[PDB]
Amino acid sequence: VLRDNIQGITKPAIRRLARRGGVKRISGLIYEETRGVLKVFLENVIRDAVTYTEHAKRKTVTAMDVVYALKRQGRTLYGFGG
Amino acid sequence: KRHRKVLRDNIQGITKPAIRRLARRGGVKRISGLIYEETRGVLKVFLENVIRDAVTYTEHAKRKTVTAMDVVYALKRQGRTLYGFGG
Amino acid sequence: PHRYRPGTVALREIRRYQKSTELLIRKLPFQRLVREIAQDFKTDLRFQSSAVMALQEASEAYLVALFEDTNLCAIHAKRVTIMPKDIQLARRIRGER
Amino acid sequence: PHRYRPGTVALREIRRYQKSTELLIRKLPFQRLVREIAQDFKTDLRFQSSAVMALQEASEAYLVALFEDTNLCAIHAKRVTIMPKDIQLARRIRGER
Amino acid sequence: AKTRSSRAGLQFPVGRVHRLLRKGNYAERVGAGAPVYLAAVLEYLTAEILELAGNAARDNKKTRIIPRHLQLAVRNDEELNKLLGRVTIAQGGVLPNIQSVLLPKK
Amino acid sequence: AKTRSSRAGLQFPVGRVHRLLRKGNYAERVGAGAPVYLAAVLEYLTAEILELAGNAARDNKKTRIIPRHLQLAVRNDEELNKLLGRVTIAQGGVLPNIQSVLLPKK
Amino acid sequence: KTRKESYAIYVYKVLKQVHPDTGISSKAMSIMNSFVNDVFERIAGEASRLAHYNKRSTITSREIQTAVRLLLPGELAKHAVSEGTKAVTKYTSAK
Amino acid sequence: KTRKESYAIYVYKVLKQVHPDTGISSKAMSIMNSFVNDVFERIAGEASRLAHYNKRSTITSREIQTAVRLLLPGELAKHAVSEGTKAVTKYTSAK
DNA sequence: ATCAATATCCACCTGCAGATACTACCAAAAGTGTATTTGGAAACTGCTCCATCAAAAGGCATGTTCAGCTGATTCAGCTGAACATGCCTTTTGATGGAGCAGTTTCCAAATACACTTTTGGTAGTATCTGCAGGTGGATATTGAT
DNA sequence: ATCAATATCCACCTGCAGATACTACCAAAAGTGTATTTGGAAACTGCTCCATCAAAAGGCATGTTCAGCTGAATCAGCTGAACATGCCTTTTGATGGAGCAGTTTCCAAATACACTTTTGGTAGTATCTGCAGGTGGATATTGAT
Ligand SMILES: [Mg+2]
């Protein structure tokens, strides 16, 4: 049952997130759109994290690699160090 | 110095035509009558925030004159960096 | 023979999910998506457990909040149904576009 | 007796103002407004003239961008007329509230 | 020997704060009061949040503060919310809030 | 008797860039390559903008680059537009752009 | 093996003064720790900038003060400034 | 009559290189001057943090390099990295 | 209205994941006493440019008019919500091994210091030139018809 | 479509602002060279904690049904654009001093270095408990009628 990983982010999971955000009714096209948006988000953050990893001459992305990437992307996260 | 003129209601020097021009540069075709007061408000908040920080820099430096640089630094802090005035 | 009206369960879920804090995407699917994306940047990468967690926390926060602005955009256009345009308008005004 | 249809001068103006770069708020009025607000934070202050210019350049740049965003909000609503609600939607989404 | 914190009446480490400032390349030099001042401010802000998060714990019939309690504390206070307005608290969820036009009709 | 700039094949000033790195307290120490590499990046970016600004000047039949040309350069280039997405060029104006639905007829 | 520092115990001391019967989860304490580090960096960062703008080699409480004013919202700034000037007075007079 | 430094003559050299018959207004030069100072500060900052994160006391051309990859978008980063690498290589061999 | 299906509420119970407690420990900060280096307020004064006055250039305020936009009403049809569960993917837990992190080493490269030269700034007085803002004159756009 | 009122686009010109120029000079640069300090790569290695996978858990892909939302069509009322008109306010150019900013002296304060005292992170072993997750039954809510 060959399938892209992006599709692992399923309708019901996206629906749950919408719900937490106070969304009552959802157009069918939202699911593909959201996947698109999430992919760009992860790309931007991951790119920056990995860049930290490579710099530290490591092969493991550390939570601190992510935390720092989030900080410079203007999305400071609390609870994973730093 | 003898006497020092009272400043009041100056927000109103931001005239209806001047606000229409800015809308135009911003690509706006039609403007409801209520936009002008709303814009005056928004501008006032914008200026307060920038002037507070600018003036804070002034005072920290023990000066009485607000510099182009005080404003430039204030603008930077608030994520509205300006080029053309020394920064 | 008992059916709930459209939107009753929708409201019910809003209340439920606004009350909890668990992550709402399944850990595994998300972990694969992360690794796949990272592969285009460097191969043979390993990820701390907490690093994947941090990414999830941040992604879901991001997406939950974007659904707020999106919802406001739908409401602005006198609707109750979020549409791709609403996401688009939100991201444009946020300066993501 | 001759007349342009409403909207024709408006578009004329958009082309005109989008083509130029001069400040669109009158200098002195803007200057009083600065001095007023500042005085309310602190008395007996002076301003380098370029500091006023800096503020004016920033303020007009801020306001012109806000109107594009505002304009988008109207259009999203299937209108061509900007209203306070549009400015408000823009500023919420922008995270100015 | 008596800690600079106890001299300044503070639970927060004036010593450590001093050190961290030097090895931070913030400036060539560091005056003696700066870490005291800085440490007070951090203590202060810690207290405020802990107070409100405690209250938030109480409301929900709890004695152990969790992330959810820090989130409710921060986003229900105008000033804390603004200071932390580009910050995400892991495992905090959101404030219950539903747009009224989405409520069913009476 | 040779400057480091000529040694590195650069117009931009390596000495100056070295000096400014030290006084900016970015770290205890500054390696020898850093000002070289940075001065090169600086020079690259300024060349890139000047190229594009020059073209805007010429497209307007002008010989002297003014702020409007810098703005046309930056805003017309996807990458320079993002690098400077939170920056304002005094006297730059905006890009001509009227949204479709605003135009006459159908 | 290497000692990993934290503000965790000072946060904990302050918790007790404020709510002596109330505890704190690991995850919560981590968040509190982030918070302190964050605000630390924001304040120091601004103070650094201030010193530089004014061609000064030293970060003094005056810089931390102005830093606090610039960074903190209205009421929070005021109280923090007072706690700050307080702590320095108390520290000076103490022998 | 204190000496106010800028990047103006270097911007002018580079200007001559790319557009030999084109001049630049002093306001346009001011913005050019601001832009270099800006990018300088932004790269130096990222470099600064990066060093710290890696418990390094030295900012090398390696730090600048990552800062550039962090700060700039795709194609500008690729090309800026060439030109800086090129300059360092040519700097090393030139003594 | 009533009636019933189901969601929601509160109380009480219980095992253990996750909290607080603890002592050794030792190592590494933080504080204490001595000698050194350095920064920046105060005192003074040149001198830039800021505040504050009168004359000329044109943009603002206001009323009138009606074009066309907005927002109400209605309505057909399309589209997303709700629904039941076996089925397939995720979760939980069990176990080697990559690699990260701790440690020690030693040297290439960085800091420091001291003449030595070069250069980037300004200042004075001059000298050149792109173009903004005026004119008139030929072609597009717009709206009535 | 045709006519015509009005904006728009050229082209050509000309004063002059503001730009390029240059000659004198200099202080603060950058450069050069020699002495001394050390950061971090480099290399070995110990133990997390990470990928992998088998077994146990349980959330979701499915298609069917229709309530109720979205969006097109229509229209009246009225807001906001255009424009004419009278003139107030800003803009432009030319004359007094508050305060900035540049020099210097001088001590109050921060650095440094070495020393001696404690605190705070870990690990060890055990010590303790707040509450998530389950039960039961009473009551609220929603939807059918
Ligand atoms: Mg006032």
CA distances from D5 to A54, B26, D2, F104, F105 (A): 63, 21, 10, 10, 12
Q: Answer whether E67 touches A (CB < 8 Å).
A: yes
Partners of chain C (3+ Cβ pairs below 8 A): A, D, E
Q: Answer whether D74 touches C (CB < 8 Å).
A: no
Tell me how far apart the terminal alpha carbons of chain F are, to the nearest angstrom.
72
CA G87 – CA G76 distance, rounded (Å): 16
In F, residues 26-45, which contact E (CB 8 Å cutoff)?
26-28
DSSP H39-68: HHHHHHHHHHHHHHHTT-SEE-HHHHHHHH
Nucleotides of I under 7 A from a protein CB: 5-8, 18-20, 28-32, 38-40, 48-53, 59-61, 67-71, 79-83, 88-91, 98-103, 109-111, 117-123, 130-132, 142-144
Beta strands in chain E (DSSP E): 29-30, 64-65, 87-89
The reply to whether residue E8 touches residue G87, judged by beta carbons under 8 angstroms, is yes
Domains of chain C (ranges, CATH numbers): 1-97 (1.10.20.10)
CA distances from A64 to A49, A52, D50, E24 (A): 9, 9, 43, 18
| Sign, Cα dihedral of E65, E71, E72, E77 | positive
Task: Answer whether F96's CB lies under 8 Å from H93's CB.
Answer: no
- Residue corresponding to tokens 């948006």: A37
- Which chain G residues contact residue A70 at CB under 8 A? none
Q: What is the resolution of this structure in A?
A: 2.8
- Which chain D residues contact residue F99 at CB under 8 A? 71-72, 75
∠ Cα B67 B72 B77 (to 5°): 130
Helices D49-76 & B16-25, crossing angle to 10 degrees? 70
Domain of residue A67 covers 1-82
CA A44 – CA A49 distance, rounded (Å): 9
Calculate the dihedral angle through the C-alpha atoms of A59, A64, A69, A74, rounding to the nearest 10 degrees: 170
Annotated domain spans of chain G: 1-95
CA C75 to chain centre: 19
Beta bridge partners of A61: C47
3-state secondary structure of E30: strand
Tell which of H22, H39, H62 to mutate to test the F interface (max F CBs under 10 Å).
H22
Tallying the residues shown for chain C, one arrives at 97
CA H64 to chain centre: 10
Q: Answer whether E3 touches G (CB < 8 Å).
A: no
- Kindly report the number of other CB atoms within 10 A of residue G73's CB atom: 15
3-state secondary structure of B31: strand
Q: Show the tokens assigned to G69.
A: 């004013």
Tell me how far apart the terminal alpha carbons of chain C are, to the nearest angstrom.
49
CA D19 – CA D13 distance, rounded (Å): 10
DSSP character at residue E77: S
CA A81 – CA A67 distance, rounded (Å): 7
3-state secondary structure of A25: strand
Q: Using a CB cutoff of 5 Å, list residues around ligand 1, an ion.
A: D 39-40
Residue ranges of alpha helices (H) inside chain B are 16-25, 35-60, 68-77
Tell me how far apart the terminal alpha carbons of chain B are, to the nearest angstrom.
34
Task: Answer whether G51's CB lies under 8 Å from G75's CB.
Answer: no
Per the entry, the structure determination technique was X-ray
- Kindly report the number of other CB atoms within 10 A of residue F43's CB atom: 29
G1-95: in CATH 1.10.20.10: yes
Helices D84-93 & C84-93, crossing angle to 10 degrees? 80
Q: After which residues is chain G broken (C to N over 2.5 A)?
A: none
∠ Cα B78 B81 B82 (to 5°): 135
Task: Answer whether F37's CB lies under 8 Å from H91's CB.
Answer: no
CATH assignment, E1-106: 1.10.20.10
Residue ranges of alpha helices (H) inside chain F are 4-8, 14-23, 33-59, 67-76, 78-83
The torsion region of residue A6 among left (phi > 0), alpha (psi -120 to 50) and beta comes to alpha
Q: How far is the CA of E104 from the C1' of J136 (A)?
A: 32
CA G41 – CA F96 distance, rounded (Å): 41
Nearest to G68 by CA among E85, F26, B56, B47: B56
Nearest to A4 by CA among C36, G19, F24: C36
CA distances from D80 to D14, D75, F90 (A): 14, 6, 29
Annotated domain spans of chain F: 1-106
3-state secondary structure of G95: coil
Task: Answer whether C18's CB lies under 8 Å from A22's CB.
Answer: yes
Q: Show the tokens assigned to D42.
A: 């602190």
Task: Answer whether F41's CB lies under 8 Å from H68's CB.
Answer: yes
Instruction: Give the β-pairing of E64-65 and D81-82.
Output: unpaired
Nearest to A77 by CA among H63, D50, H45, E84: E84
